[PDB]
Tab-separated table of N, CA and C in Angstrom:
chain	number	residue	atom	x	y	z
A	1	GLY	N	-117.743	-120.286	56.391
A	1	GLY	CA	-117.608	-118.839	56.432
A	1	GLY	C	-118.974	-118.159	56.319
A	2	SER	N	-119.099	-117.036	57.012
A	2	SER	CA	-120.342	-116.283	56.999
A	2	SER	C	-120.136	-114.923	57.670
A	3	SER	N	-121.145	-114.074	57.536
A	3	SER	CA	-121.088	-112.747	58.123
A	3	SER	C	-119.999	-111.918	57.438
A	4	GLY	N	-120.204	-110.609	57.444
A	4	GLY	CA	-119.251	-109.700	56.829
A	4	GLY	C	-119.261	-108.340	57.530
A	5	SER	N	-118.833	-107.326	56.792
A	5	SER	CA	-118.787	-105.977	57.327
A	5	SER	C	-118.514	-104.976	56.204
A	6	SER	N	-118.636	-103.702	56.545
A	6	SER	CA	-118.405	-102.642	55.578
A	6	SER	C	-118.586	-101.277	56.246
A	7	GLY	N	-118.174	-100.243	55.526
A	7	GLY	CA	-118.285	-98.886	56.035
A	7	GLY	C	-118.191	-97.866	54.898
A	8	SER	N	-118.109	-96.601	55.287
A	8	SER	CA	-118.014	-95.525	54.315
A	8	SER	C	-117.109	-94.414	54.851
A	9	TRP	N	-117.540	-93.826	55.958
A	9	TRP	CA	-116.782	-92.754	56.579
A	9	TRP	C	-116.781	-91.559	55.622
A	10	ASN	N	-116.565	-90.384	56.195
A	10	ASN	CA	-116.538	-89.162	55.409
A	10	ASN	C	-115.213	-89.080	54.648
A	11	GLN	N	-114.135	-88.966	55.410
A	11	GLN	CA	-112.809	-88.878	54.823
A	11	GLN	C	-112.349	-90.255	54.341
A	12	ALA	N	-111.275	-90.248	53.565
A	12	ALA	CA	-110.727	-91.485	53.034
A	12	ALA	C	-109.198	-91.410	53.056
A	13	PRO	N	-108.568	-92.609	53.176
A	13	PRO	CA	-107.117	-92.691	53.210
A	13	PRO	C	-106.522	-92.477	51.817
A	14	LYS	N	-105.599	-91.530	51.741
A	14	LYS	CA	-104.948	-91.218	50.481
A	14	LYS	C	-103.479	-91.636	50.553
A	15	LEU	N	-102.964	-92.074	49.413
A	15	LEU	CA	-101.579	-92.506	49.334
A	15	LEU	C	-100.966	-92.000	48.027
A	16	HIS	N	-99.881	-91.251	48.170
A	16	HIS	CA	-99.193	-90.702	47.015
A	16	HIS	C	-98.085	-91.661	46.574
A	17	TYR	N	-97.930	-91.771	45.263
A	17	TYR	CA	-96.914	-92.645	44.700
A	17	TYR	C	-96.579	-92.243	43.263
A	18	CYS	N	-95.296	-92.324	42.944
A	18	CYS	CA	-94.832	-91.974	41.612
A	18	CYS	C	-94.285	-93.238	40.945
A	19	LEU	N	-94.969	-93.655	39.890
A	19	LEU	CA	-94.565	-94.842	39.157
A	19	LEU	C	-93.575	-94.448	38.060
A	20	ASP	N	-92.510	-95.229	37.957
A	20	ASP	CA	-91.488	-94.973	36.958
A	20	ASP	C	-90.666	-96.244	36.737
A	21	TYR	N	-90.818	-96.811	35.551
A	21	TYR	CA	-90.099	-98.025	35.203
A	21	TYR	C	-88.865	-97.708	34.355
A	22	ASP	N	-87.703	-97.936	34.951
A	22	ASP	CA	-86.449	-97.680	34.265
A	22	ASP	C	-86.031	-98.932	33.490
A	23	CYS	N	-86.542	-99.031	32.272
A	23	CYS	CA	-86.231	-100.168	31.421
A	23	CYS	C	-84.742	-100.483	31.565
A	24	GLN	N	-83.961	-99.428	31.749
A	24	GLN	CA	-82.524	-99.579	31.902
A	24	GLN	C	-82.209	-100.473	33.103
A	25	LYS	N	-82.848	-100.158	34.220
A	25	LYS	CA	-82.645	-100.921	35.439
A	25	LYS	C	-83.698	-102.029	35.523
A	26	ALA	N	-84.608	-102.010	34.560
A	26	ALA	CA	-85.668	-103.004	34.512
A	26	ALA	C	-86.245	-103.195	35.917
A	27	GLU	N	-86.406	-102.078	36.612
A	27	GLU	CA	-86.945	-102.109	37.961
A	27	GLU	C	-88.008	-101.021	38.133
A	28	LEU	N	-89.149	-101.433	38.668
A	28	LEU	CA	-90.248	-100.508	38.890
A	28	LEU	C	-89.950	-99.657	40.125
A	29	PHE	N	-90.384	-98.407	40.062
A	29	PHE	CA	-90.173	-97.483	41.164
A	29	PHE	C	-91.490	-96.841	41.603
A	30	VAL	N	-91.613	-96.651	42.908
A	30	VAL	CA	-92.812	-96.050	43.467
A	30	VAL	C	-92.414	-94.986	44.491
A	31	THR	N	-91.873	-93.889	43.980
A	31	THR	CA	-91.447	-92.795	44.835
A	31	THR	C	-92.626	-91.870	45.145
A	32	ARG	N	-92.294	-90.684	45.634
A	32	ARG	CA	-93.311	-89.705	45.974
A	32	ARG	C	-94.356	-90.325	46.904
A	33	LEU	N	-93.895	-90.718	48.082
A	33	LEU	CA	-94.774	-91.326	49.066
A	33	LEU	C	-95.348	-90.234	49.972
A	34	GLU	N	-96.670	-90.136	49.963
A	34	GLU	CA	-97.352	-89.143	50.776
A	34	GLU	C	-98.738	-89.652	51.181
A	35	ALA	N	-98.782	-90.292	52.341
A	35	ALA	CA	-100.033	-90.828	52.851
A	35	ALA	C	-100.863	-89.692	53.450
A	36	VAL	N	-102.152	-89.717	53.141
A	36	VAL	CA	-103.061	-88.699	53.641
A	36	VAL	C	-104.180	-89.370	54.440
A	37	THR	N	-103.908	-89.576	55.720
A	37	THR	CA	-104.879	-90.204	56.600
A	37	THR	C	-105.104	-89.345	57.845
A	38	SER	N	-106.309	-88.804	57.941
A	38	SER	CA	-106.665	-87.963	59.071
A	38	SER	C	-107.389	-88.794	60.134
A	39	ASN	N	-106.665	-89.087	61.204
A	39	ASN	CA	-107.223	-89.870	62.293
A	39	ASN	C	-106.241	-89.878	63.466
A	40	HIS	N	-106.769	-90.202	64.638
A	40	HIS	CA	-105.953	-90.250	65.839
A	40	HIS	C	-106.453	-91.368	66.755
A	41	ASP	N	-105.502	-92.115	67.297
A	41	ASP	CA	-105.832	-93.214	68.189
A	41	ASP	C	-104.572	-94.036	68.465
A	42	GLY	N	-103.827	-93.597	69.470
A	42	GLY	CA	-102.601	-94.280	69.847
A	42	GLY	C	-101.428	-93.815	68.981
A	43	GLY	N	-100.545	-94.758	68.683
A	43	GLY	CA	-99.381	-94.461	67.867
A	43	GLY	C	-98.808	-95.736	67.243
A	44	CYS	N	-98.253	-95.575	66.051
A	44	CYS	CA	-97.669	-96.700	65.340
A	44	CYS	C	-96.826	-96.153	64.185
A	45	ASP	N	-95.848	-96.950	63.780
A	45	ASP	CA	-94.967	-96.559	62.693
A	45	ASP	C	-95.543	-97.067	61.369
A	46	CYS	N	-96.265	-96.182	60.697
A	46	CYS	CA	-96.873	-96.526	59.423
A	46	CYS	C	-95.804	-96.417	58.334
A	47	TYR	N	-95.978	-97.221	57.296
A	47	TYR	CA	-95.039	-97.225	56.187
A	47	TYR	C	-95.713	-97.704	54.899
A	48	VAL	N	-95.104	-97.340	53.780
A	48	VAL	CA	-95.632	-97.724	52.482
A	48	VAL	C	-95.002	-99.051	52.053
A	49	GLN	N	-95.782	-99.829	51.317
A	49	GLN	CA	-95.315	-101.118	50.837
A	49	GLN	C	-95.840	-101.382	49.424
A	50	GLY	N	-94.905	-101.586	48.509
A	50	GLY	CA	-95.257	-101.848	47.124
A	50	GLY	C	-95.002	-103.312	46.761
A	51	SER	N	-96.051	-103.959	46.272
A	51	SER	CA	-95.955	-105.356	45.885
A	51	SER	C	-96.143	-105.494	44.373
A	52	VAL	N	-95.243	-106.250	43.762
A	52	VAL	CA	-95.299	-106.469	42.327
A	52	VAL	C	-95.368	-107.971	42.047
A	53	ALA	N	-96.125	-108.315	41.016
A	53	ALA	CA	-96.284	-109.708	40.635
A	53	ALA	C	-95.889	-109.877	39.166
A	54	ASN	N	-94.820	-110.631	38.957
A	54	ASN	CA	-94.330	-110.878	37.612
A	54	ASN	C	-94.488	-112.364	37.281
A	55	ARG	N	-94.567	-112.646	35.989
A	55	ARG	CA	-94.719	-114.015	35.529
A	55	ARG	C	-93.689	-114.921	36.208
A	56	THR	N	-92.609	-114.299	36.660
A	56	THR	CA	-91.548	-115.033	37.327
A	56	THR	C	-91.916	-115.294	38.788
A	57	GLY	N	-92.657	-114.355	39.356
A	57	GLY	CA	-93.082	-114.469	40.740
A	57	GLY	C	-93.691	-113.157	41.238
A	58	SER	N	-93.101	-112.634	42.302
A	58	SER	CA	-93.572	-111.389	42.884
A	58	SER	C	-92.468	-110.756	43.733
A	59	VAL	N	-92.671	-109.489	44.061
A	59	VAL	CA	-91.704	-108.760	44.864
A	59	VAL	C	-92.445	-107.887	45.880
A	60	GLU	N	-91.667	-107.219	46.718
A	60	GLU	CA	-92.235	-106.352	47.736
A	60	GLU	C	-91.180	-105.363	48.239
A	61	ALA	N	-91.580	-104.101	48.301
A	61	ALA	CA	-90.683	-103.055	48.761
A	61	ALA	C	-91.425	-102.151	49.747
A	62	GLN	N	-90.653	-101.333	50.448
A	62	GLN	CA	-91.221	-100.418	51.423
A	62	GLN	C	-90.215	-99.320	51.770
A	63	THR	N	-90.687	-98.351	52.542
A	63	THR	CA	-89.842	-97.242	52.951
A	63	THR	C	-89.545	-97.323	54.450
A	64	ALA	N	-88.769	-96.356	54.919
A	64	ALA	CA	-88.404	-96.306	56.324
A	64	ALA	C	-89.615	-95.861	57.147
A	65	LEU	N	-89.826	-96.556	58.254
A	65	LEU	CA	-90.941	-96.244	59.132
A	65	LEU	C	-90.974	-94.737	59.392
A	66	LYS	N	-92.167	-94.246	59.694
A	66	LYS	CA	-92.348	-92.830	59.966
A	66	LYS	C	-93.293	-92.660	61.157
A	67	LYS	N	-93.630	-91.409	61.429
A	67	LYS	CA	-94.524	-91.098	62.533
A	67	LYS	C	-95.901	-90.728	61.979
A	68	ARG	N	-96.843	-91.641	62.166
A	68	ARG	CA	-98.200	-91.425	61.694
A	68	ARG	C	-98.623	-89.975	61.940
A	69	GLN	N	-98.924	-89.287	60.849
A	69	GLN	CA	-99.343	-87.898	60.931
A	69	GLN	C	-100.522	-87.641	59.990
A	70	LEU	N	-100.959	-86.391	59.969
A	70	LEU	CA	-102.074	-86.002	59.122
A	70	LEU	C	-101.609	-85.960	57.665
A	71	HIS	N	-100.305	-86.107	57.488
A	71	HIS	CA	-99.722	-86.088	56.157
A	71	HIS	C	-98.238	-86.451	56.240
A	72	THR	N	-97.971	-87.744	56.129
A	72	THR	CA	-96.604	-88.234	56.191
A	72	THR	C	-95.977	-88.239	54.795
A	73	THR	N	-94.689	-87.929	54.759
A	73	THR	CA	-93.963	-87.895	53.501
A	73	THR	C	-92.593	-88.558	53.658
A	74	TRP	N	-92.199	-89.281	52.620
A	74	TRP	CA	-90.919	-89.969	52.630
A	74	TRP	C	-89.975	-89.224	51.684
A	75	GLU	N	-88.739	-89.700	51.635
A	75	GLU	CA	-87.736	-89.091	50.780
A	75	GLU	C	-87.366	-90.040	49.637
A	76	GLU	N	-87.352	-91.325	49.959
A	76	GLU	CA	-87.018	-92.340	48.975
A	76	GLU	C	-88.291	-93.012	48.453
A	77	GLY	N	-88.095	-93.940	47.527
A	77	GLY	CA	-89.212	-94.661	46.943
A	77	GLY	C	-88.942	-96.166	46.921
A	78	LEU	N	-89.954	-96.911	46.501
A	78	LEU	CA	-89.839	-98.358	46.428
A	78	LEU	C	-89.084	-98.742	45.154
A	79	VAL	N	-88.798	-100.030	45.039
A	79	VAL	CA	-88.084	-100.538	43.880
A	79	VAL	C	-88.421	-102.017	43.686
A	80	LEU	N	-89.369	-102.263	42.794
A	80	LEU	CA	-89.793	-103.623	42.507
A	80	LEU	C	-89.192	-104.069	41.172
A	81	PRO	N	-88.525	-105.254	41.210
A	81	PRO	CA	-87.903	-105.801	40.016
A	81	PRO	C	-88.953	-106.382	39.067
A	82	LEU	N	-88.831	-106.009	37.801
A	82	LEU	CA	-89.759	-106.483	36.789
A	82	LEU	C	-89.101	-106.379	35.411
A	83	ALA	N	-89.623	-107.164	34.480
A	83	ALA	CA	-89.098	-107.169	33.126
A	83	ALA	C	-90.080	-106.451	32.199
A	84	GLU	N	-89.522	-105.665	31.291
A	84	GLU	CA	-90.334	-104.920	30.343
A	84	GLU	C	-91.265	-105.867	29.583
A	85	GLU	N	-90.911	-107.144	29.612
A	85	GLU	CA	-91.702	-108.155	28.933
A	85	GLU	C	-92.831	-108.646	29.843
A	86	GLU	N	-92.764	-108.223	31.096
A	86	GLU	CA	-93.769	-108.610	32.071
A	86	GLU	C	-94.521	-107.377	32.577
A	87	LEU	N	-94.283	-106.261	31.904
A	87	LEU	CA	-94.928	-105.012	32.272
A	87	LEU	C	-96.443	-105.166	32.131
A	88	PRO	N	-96.861	-105.688	30.947
A	88	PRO	CA	-98.274	-105.890	30.675
A	88	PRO	C	-98.811	-107.103	31.438
A	89	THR	N	-97.885	-107.862	32.004
A	89	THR	CA	-98.250	-109.048	32.761
A	89	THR	C	-97.796	-108.913	34.215
A	90	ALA	N	-97.781	-107.674	34.685
A	90	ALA	CA	-97.371	-107.396	36.051
A	90	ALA	C	-98.189	-106.224	36.596
A	91	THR	N	-98.398	-106.246	37.904
A	91	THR	CA	-99.157	-105.196	38.559
A	91	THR	C	-98.471	-104.771	39.858
A	92	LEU	N	-98.728	-103.530	40.247
A	92	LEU	CA	-98.144	-102.991	41.464
A	92	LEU	C	-99.260	-102.647	42.452
A	93	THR	N	-99.270	-103.372	43.560
A	93	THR	CA	-100.274	-103.154	44.588
A	93	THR	C	-99.643	-102.502	45.820
A	94	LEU	N	-100.111	-101.299	46.118
A	94	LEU	CA	-99.604	-100.562	47.262
A	94	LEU	C	-100.375	-100.979	48.516
A	95	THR	N	-99.667	-100.977	49.636
A	95	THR	CA	-100.271	-101.353	50.903
A	95	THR	C	-99.669	-100.530	52.044
A	96	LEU	N	-100.515	-100.217	53.015
A	96	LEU	CA	-100.081	-99.439	54.163
A	96	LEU	C	-100.269	-100.267	55.436
A	97	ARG	N	-99.168	-100.845	55.895
A	97	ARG	CA	-99.198	-101.662	57.096
A	97	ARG	C	-98.684	-100.862	58.295
A	98	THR	N	-99.266	-101.148	59.450
A	98	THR	CA	-98.880	-100.466	60.673
A	98	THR	C	-97.956	-101.353	61.509
A	99	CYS	N	-96.808	-100.792	61.860
A	99	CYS	CA	-95.833	-101.518	62.656
A	99	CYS	C	-96.512	-101.974	63.949
A	100	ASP	N	-96.797	-103.267	64.005
A	100	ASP	CA	-97.442	-103.841	65.173
A	100	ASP	C	-96.817	-105.204	65.479
A	101	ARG	N	-97.185	-105.742	66.633
A	101	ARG	CA	-96.671	-107.034	67.053
A	101	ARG	C	-96.604	-107.992	65.862
A	102	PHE	N	-97.777	-108.324	65.344
A	102	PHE	CA	-97.866	-109.227	64.209
A	102	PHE	C	-98.737	-108.631	63.101
A	103	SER	N	-98.822	-107.309	63.106
A	103	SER	CA	-99.616	-106.606	62.112
A	103	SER	C	-101.082	-107.031	62.217
A	104	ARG	N	-101.636	-106.839	63.406
A	104	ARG	CA	-103.023	-107.196	63.650
A	104	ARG	C	-103.954	-106.319	62.809
A	105	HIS	N	-104.189	-106.765	61.584
A	105	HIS	CA	-105.054	-106.034	60.675
A	105	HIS	C	-104.773	-106.472	59.236
A	106	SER	N	-103.551	-106.933	59.020
A	106	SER	CA	-103.143	-107.384	57.700
A	106	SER	C	-102.670	-106.193	56.863
A	107	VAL	N	-103.606	-105.299	56.582
A	107	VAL	CA	-103.300	-104.118	55.794
A	107	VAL	C	-104.206	-102.966	56.235
A	108	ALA	N	-103.609	-101.788	56.330
A	108	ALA	CA	-104.347	-100.605	56.739
A	108	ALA	C	-105.053	-100.004	55.522
A	109	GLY	N	-104.404	-100.141	54.374
A	109	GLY	CA	-104.955	-99.618	53.136
A	109	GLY	C	-104.159	-100.116	51.928
A	110	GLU	N	-104.865	-100.786	51.029
A	110	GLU	CA	-104.238	-101.317	49.831
A	110	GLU	C	-104.684	-100.521	48.601
A	111	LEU	N	-103.751	-100.352	47.676
A	111	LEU	CA	-104.033	-99.616	46.455
A	111	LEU	C	-103.621	-100.461	45.249
A	112	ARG	N	-104.396	-100.330	44.182
A	112	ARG	CA	-104.125	-101.073	42.963
A	112	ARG	C	-103.606	-100.132	41.873
A	113	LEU	N	-102.611	-100.616	41.144
A	113	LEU	CA	-102.019	-99.833	40.073
A	113	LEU	C	-101.655	-100.759	38.910
A	114	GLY	N	-101.235	-100.143	37.815
A	114	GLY	CA	-100.855	-100.897	36.632
A	114	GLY	C	-99.482	-100.458	36.119
A	115	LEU	N	-98.762	-101.417	35.555
A	115	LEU	CA	-97.438	-101.143	35.023
A	115	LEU	C	-97.517	-101.039	33.499
A	116	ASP	N	-98.406	-101.838	32.928
A	116	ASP	CA	-98.590	-101.847	31.486
A	116	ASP	C	-98.575	-100.409	30.967
A	117	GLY	N	-99.154	-99.520	31.763
A	117	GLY	CA	-99.214	-98.115	31.396
A	117	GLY	C	-100.648	-97.695	31.068
A	118	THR	N	-101.579	-98.221	31.851
A	118	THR	CA	-102.985	-97.911	31.655
A	118	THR	C	-103.523	-97.106	32.841
A	119	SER	N	-103.909	-97.832	33.880
A	119	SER	CA	-104.442	-97.201	35.076
A	119	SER	C	-103.664	-95.919	35.382
A	120	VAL	N	-102.407	-96.103	35.758
A	120	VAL	CA	-101.550	-94.975	36.080
A	120	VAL	C	-100.350	-94.965	35.132
A	121	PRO	N	-100.064	-93.755	34.579
A	121	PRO	CA	-98.951	-93.597	33.660
A	121	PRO	C	-97.616	-93.609	34.407
A	122	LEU	N	-96.541	-93.655	33.633
A	122	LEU	CA	-95.206	-93.671	34.206
A	122	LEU	C	-94.656	-92.245	34.250
A	123	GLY	N	-93.740	-92.026	35.181
A	123	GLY	CA	-93.129	-90.716	35.339
A	123	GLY	C	-94.183	-89.656	35.665
A	124	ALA	N	-95.368	-90.134	36.020
A	124	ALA	CA	-96.464	-89.243	36.358
A	124	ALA	C	-96.963	-89.567	37.767
A	125	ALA	N	-96.531	-88.751	38.716
A	125	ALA	CA	-96.925	-88.938	40.103
A	125	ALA	C	-98.378	-88.493	40.280
A	126	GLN	N	-99.186	-89.411	40.791
A	126	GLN	CA	-100.594	-89.127	41.015
A	126	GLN	C	-101.045	-89.708	42.357
A	127	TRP	N	-101.986	-89.014	42.980
A	127	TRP	CA	-102.510	-89.448	44.262
A	127	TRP	C	-103.478	-90.607	44.011
A	128	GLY	N	-103.854	-91.268	45.096
A	128	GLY	CA	-104.771	-92.391	45.006
A	128	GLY	C	-105.291	-92.787	46.390
A	129	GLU	N	-106.584	-93.071	46.442
A	129	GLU	CA	-107.215	-93.462	47.691
A	129	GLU	C	-106.955	-94.942	47.977
A	130	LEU	N	-106.710	-95.233	49.246
A	130	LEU	CA	-106.446	-96.600	49.663
A	130	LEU	C	-107.761	-97.381	49.695
A	131	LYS	N	-107.718	-98.572	49.116
A	131	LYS	CA	-108.894	-99.425	49.072
A	131	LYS	C	-108.916	-100.320	50.311
A	132	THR	N	-108.932	-99.675	51.469
A	132	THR	CA	-108.953	-100.398	52.728
A	132	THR	C	-109.851	-101.632	52.620
A	133	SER	N	-110.959	-101.458	51.915
A	133	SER	CA	-111.906	-102.545	51.729
A	133	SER	C	-112.336	-103.103	53.086
A	134	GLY	N	-113.347	-102.468	53.658
A	134	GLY	CA	-113.862	-102.889	54.950
A	134	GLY	C	-113.640	-101.805	56.008
A	135	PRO	N	-114.188	-102.071	57.225
A	135	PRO	CA	-114.056	-101.131	58.325
A	135	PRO	C	-112.645	-101.169	58.914
A	136	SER	N	-112.206	-102.376	59.239
A	136	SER	CA	-110.883	-102.563	59.809
A	136	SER	C	-110.872	-102.105	61.269
A	137	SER	N	-111.225	-100.842	61.462
A	137	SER	CA	-111.260	-100.271	62.797
A	137	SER	C	-112.437	-100.850	63.584
A	138	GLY	N	-112.310	-100.800	64.901
A	138	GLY	CA	-113.350	-101.315	65.775
A	138	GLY	C	-113.227	-102.830	65.942
């Protein structure tokens, strides 16, 4: 392996998400989906994807495809299964994949969050920039 890449760009991809763990349902939730990506180039059905990793394993959720816009919004939220005993030992990683043949890109924008209740609090919807990590485009 060798060679790499990187970028900066003026604007940045934003992704809205509301974390809420219903100990009752012992299931993590990531509602309030609002991607903020200003760009144009073709068309694709972008969607949100929440991945959780528990001592037991991992999970993955997503919403209904939408029409890539300057500000897409969903109505429902994700639902990742987790145990309150794995809250401090579990994390929620958001990802924005573009509906493509085989998802030529892997991820459009990944976001990191916490369930323990540190990084991002519960029942507190907050915005967050996608850690695309790299150029991706071009």
